[PDB]
Amino acid sequence: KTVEQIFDERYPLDKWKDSNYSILDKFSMRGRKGFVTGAAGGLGRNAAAALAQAGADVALVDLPSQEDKLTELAKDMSERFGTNVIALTCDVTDTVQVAELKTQLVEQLGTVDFAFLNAGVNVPGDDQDATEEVWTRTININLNGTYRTGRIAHEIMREHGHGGSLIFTAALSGHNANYMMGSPTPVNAYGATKAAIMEHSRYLAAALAKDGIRSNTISPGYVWSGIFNGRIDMPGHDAMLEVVPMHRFGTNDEIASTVLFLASDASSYVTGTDIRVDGGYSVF
Template identity: 30%
Template structure:
């Protein structure tokens, strides 16, 4: 079978853990040059080395997506080194578990900066490159919590809901340039994000909230990302793919 992303250049933010890390491996195995962006040099360089060892192509660029300068640098460096950007996955994100009235203003800003403002900035700098190419796929990692509420997740709900509507705006705005923009809305997925925030008992209960009776795996989300990045989804834009074990069908 031909490689589905042969010679495509793909930026994956938050590529050093969980869903982003799974995307790095899926994409490099399909022939993409992957640029993984994240804060941890140790993790990033380890994944980069692992991909190279497998015969794939990956480059780690240290990036804190809450810093506009870092994002600008990420996009510029990618362009300089690889001349193009075919896929952007806005995946970096943080969770939060606190009722809104107890939340500090600074914490609200932190969640919104990392989960939503970074999407604006990554798109702002990537879109001109994609416009020149007349082609590109932007994938925003939203959530089922961009559709339905969840106790303790006020800022997170707002950030993911905002991301879903921003996606529709971008899809309309840049369709004429051949740029497709979609979200993936995962249900609860077994990643460090979830494991950090919730105890094993709660995780078990969360699994039962999904009609399929379990949590999802990062690879099950990466499969959807691969579809949206590839030519197989060439008529898909401005929409969401729910990878949620039936959670939002209820």
């Protein structure tokens, strides 16, 4: 029937039988623009760098204090991959800076096709006796900060009248209390925010599907991004990887490839789900 002809047109079965078509083209980010938060840190800058090499304009977003490190990273990535990689400072806990970041993203870059909302922090003393300061500091940065930065991203997309890809950095702390030889790590408030970020991403996926916007999370395990260099002896290293079958820390590049996949058309039917990158931690 015409009903079957409609389905056969809507859903092509074998694009690989077109000479001009390639499955590798899906991982391209050419003619696309977006921003990366916490882009001074290992996961942020490496993710941004991977998106730039795929051929995307990337605004490197981090604290005002990182302005110098941002602008030189923005310059290095620009000359390396011949892309418009700019630097924009914004404290994500300050609404005024977030409101002004929205303005500069649209003006300096052009639009937002993707957003890697990676900015986050683990506060010391984040255990069962996490104080009001330790609790609220984590909630204000991880949950409220992300929400705001996530909001301006999908605000621009709808206002510009096109789709896009939201990638929120969660954690296994959002799934499990991180195991350390009988006792858990201090990730009480930290885990709560990442679990909140996860179900937030899931809601936006459901709500913004009609707008052509996908929303997914990456839950990295132990990744050696530079966060705690010279702050973990090999006794600690080998002790931490007890419960990681692969018995090694992840690297920034192994997260960068996952961000690329979620940002690109390779994941065009992936929304409202999580991709764990933990070397099999979640199995235990």
